[PDB]
Amino acid sequence: QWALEDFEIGRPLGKGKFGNVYLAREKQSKFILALKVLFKAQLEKAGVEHQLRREVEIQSHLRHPNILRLYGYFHDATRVYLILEYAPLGTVYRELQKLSKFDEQRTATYITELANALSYCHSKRVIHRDIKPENLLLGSAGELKIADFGWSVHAPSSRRTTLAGTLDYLPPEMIEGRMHDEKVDLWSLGVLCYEFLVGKPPFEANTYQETYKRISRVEFTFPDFVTEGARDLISRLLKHNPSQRPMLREVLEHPWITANSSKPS
Ligand SMILES: Nc1ncnc2c1ncn2[C@@H]1O[C@H](COP(=O)(O)OP(=O)(O)O)[C@@H](O)[C@H]1O
Ligand SMILES: COC(=O)c1sc(-c2cccs2)cc1N
Ligand SMILES: [Cl-]
Ligand SMILES: [Cl-]
Ligand SMILES: [Cl-]
Ligand SMILES: [Mg+2]
Ligand SMILES: [Mg+2]
């Protein structure tokens, strides 16, 4: 159906481990979108074709205003192209580097939008497993949108793929290679809430080995400026035991969230 000849390519939007993402316009309709380019050699070398099909299958069937749309795909001799919704305001990662820290209103609003999107995903027993600032995009009205579903699966699950980069957003059960479920996304939600308010993730360290130690032992402390309500929510989400992490509705109706969020459940 679709081919490369159907698009005019624009400026690079960003780069990932496998993905090179470009702004693009469909020639006949003038529709502006994002084109995620992956190299097949690369894909075969790492043996992650199953991850890419899951990304296409899962994300194309999800429909939610806080989740990035995937319209379709095509491939040629050397590359695979994912046709994505274009997010014009960029990543949360870039916004964080710009402002150093977010205030409580901005943070609570982002968390509400995240929890809404995750609640939708978990209703289909879909777990994202890779929630972090680089994978959170921003729409034209500044609304948060979850993207990059390459690591998503159906719960329950194990891990048959090698962990690539940072451990900073993964729960103990995940880094220890144990079986896991939906509660992994709630651990990540706690890590994000901390990083939004403080400017860095709670278990950050100089080495892989040291980061692993802090996560498994849940070693983190708060700066003085972090308020009581924020500390309560974060402490509840960062529990070593997955079953003691709250449900997403508990997050959405948490007193600190309701008092500071500008968006509803
Ligand atoms: N739809 C989009 N709109 C704008 N920028 C995007 C979009 N998709 C990806 N990007 C940019 O490209 C980067 C990599 O995209 P991603 O799909 O996460 O690649 P990978 O799966 O290799 O991590 C993102 O961090 C983001 O900066
Ligand atoms: C060497 O080829 C590959 O790795 C791949 S991955 C892929 C697809 C992934 C998701 C939808 S289609 C097609 C080919 N041909
Ligand atoms: Cl498995
Ligand atoms: Cl896996
Ligand atoms: Cl819930
Ligand atoms: Mg990514
Ligand atoms: Mg990916």
Side-chain angles (χ1 to χ4, degrees), residues 1-14 16 18-56 58-159 161-209 211-212 214-262 264-265:
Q1 193 179 8
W2 290 119
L4 186 63
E5 58 175 13
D6 295 316
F7 303 92
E8 287 179 325
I9 316 298
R11 77 157 176 98
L13 290 174
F18 292 94
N20 293 335
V21 186
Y22 300 88
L23 186 70
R25 184 179 70 169
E26 197 280 313
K27 284 182 175 177
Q28 298 171 9
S29 66
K30 300 188 201 168
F31 195 94
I32 291 287
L33 48 94
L35 217 57
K36 182 172 178 172
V37 182
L38 308 113
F39 289 102
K40 284 181 174 178
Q42 233 154 129
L43 284 175
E44 172 175 327
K45 172 85 182 186
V48 292
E49 294 97 334
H50 66 276
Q51 277 196 347
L52 195 53
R53 301 168 192 136
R54 193 129 51 192
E55 182 167 354
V56 174
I58 295 271
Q59 197 171 350
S60 66
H61 282 93
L62 296 172
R63 302 293 165 90
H64 192 281
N66 293 118
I67 298 178
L68 194 80
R69 290 289 322 273
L70 189 150
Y71 298 121
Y73 72 97
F74 58 98
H75 63 77
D76 52 21
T78 55
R79 293 172 299 272
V80 182
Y81 309 79
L82 304 193
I83 301 173
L84 305 173
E85 166 189 1
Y86 163 58
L89 291 211
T91 68
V92 174
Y93 178 90
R94 162 167 161 214
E95 192 78 1
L96 191 59
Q97 291 255 299
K98 188 175 68 183
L99 302 177
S100 296
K101 306 179 310 170
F102 298 156
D103 57 37
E104 292 193 310
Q105 287 71 48
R106 189 181 195 93
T107 298
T109 300
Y110 280 166
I111 297 296
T112 295
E113 294 180 311
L114 260 168
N116 279 340
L118 288 178
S119 186
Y120 175 87
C121 291
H122 290 179
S123 74
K124 314 187 177 306
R125 293 218 77 184
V126 169
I127 60 191
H128 190 282
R129 304 200 300 179
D130 196 19
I131 306 284
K132 60 197 187 186
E134 310 97 276
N135 288 338
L136 305 176
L137 312 180
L138 294 169
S140 61
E143 74 275 24
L144 178 140
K145 293 177 186 284
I146 302 182
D148 197 355
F149 277 80
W151 271 96
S152 65
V153 287
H154 285 74
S157 182
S158 179
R159 183 175 51 81
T161 323
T162 295
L163 288 177
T166 178
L167 293 181
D168 278 308
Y169 303 90
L170 301 174
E173 65 268 26
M174 186 123 183
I175 69 173
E176 291 171 354
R178 294 142 52 195
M179 331 164 255
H180 54 271
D181 55 16
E182 284 84 354
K183 292 300 187 184
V184 297
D185 286 335
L186 275 100
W187 171 279
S188 295
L189 188 61
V191 178
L192 282 173
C193 189
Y194 185 100
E195 186 175 6
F196 287 171
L197 292 168
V198 176
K200 60 181 187 296
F203 310 108
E204 183 174 83
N206 282 307
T207 76
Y208 180 100
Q209 289 79 359
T211 299
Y212 184 95
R214 294 188 75 202
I215 293 175
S216 55
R217 296 170 180 188
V218 200
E219 298 187 20
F220 71 95
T221 55
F222 296 106
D224 287 338
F225 60 82
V226 183
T227 66
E228 227 194 70
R231 295 184 185 213
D232 183 85
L233 175 56
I234 291 172
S235 291
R236 287 176 185 259
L237 289 168
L238 296 181
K239 297 285 188 183
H240 186 276
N241 192 332
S243 55
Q244 276 221 291
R245 295 164 203 167
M247 307 228 65
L248 282 164
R249 183 194 36 235
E250 298 181 60
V251 180
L252 287 162
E253 289 177 355
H254 191 278
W256 182 80
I257 289 295
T258 52
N260 292 285
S261 177
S262 53
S265 154

